[PDB]
Design a binder for this molecule. Sequence first.
Ligand SMILES: O=C(O)c1ccc(NC(=O)c2cccc(CC3CCCCC3)n2)c(Nc2cccc(OC(F)(F)F)c2)c1
Length: 188
Amino acid sequence: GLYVGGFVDVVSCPKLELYLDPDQVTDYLPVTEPLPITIEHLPETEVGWTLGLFQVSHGIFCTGAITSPAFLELASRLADTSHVARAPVKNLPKEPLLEILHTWLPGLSLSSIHPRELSQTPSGPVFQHVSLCALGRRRGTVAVYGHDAEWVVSRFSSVSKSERAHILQHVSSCRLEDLSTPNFVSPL
Ligand SMILES: O=C(O)c1ccc(NC(=O)c2cccc(CC3CCCCC3)n2)c(Nc2cccc(OC(F)(F)F)c2)c1
């Protein structure tokens, strides 16, 4: 069980593309229904689920859980045994897993439909998934990975106490065990 949090970039047709202003989608927030957490908008890389997308003072904040056993075990092995994975991280970190995810997947990209379908009334869901990304971070903040949801939200000074309380209310109400098993498979 691993938690992630941070401010997101809102992209439409990712890697195909248009970055959106957070205000173009605030009318459709919050989103407390689980959305899949994938990697670089790739299919079959679901590693977890969103626990809440909230509009706060300085943009759209995301809190999610990384639940894929295959991904956690693979990432943990690389963090403990790979000189390449540890090259861009400070020497001898206490939590090599967290620091490596923090360094290699800093971006949280929120997938969305085209804006031309938002000015009108959208027919279907506006958001498709959130992605951990190695590139493309603009307005978003570097994703924070940790073991306690409260600890993750604490690392962001851009979130007031009242906001933080609103987040943990919807995060604490979600049990990670009731979530579906992500479909991630190791591409090794
Ligand atoms: O076999 C191949 O041809 C193949 C070769 C390399 C791949 N990855 C990269 O080039 C790449 C680049 C930057 C970041 C990441 C993700 C982190 C994950 C934590 C550990 C550090 C790396 N991956 C992938 N694609 C890939 C898909 C999803 C996850 C992933 O990481 C892992 F496989 F380790 F889970 C790699 C595939």
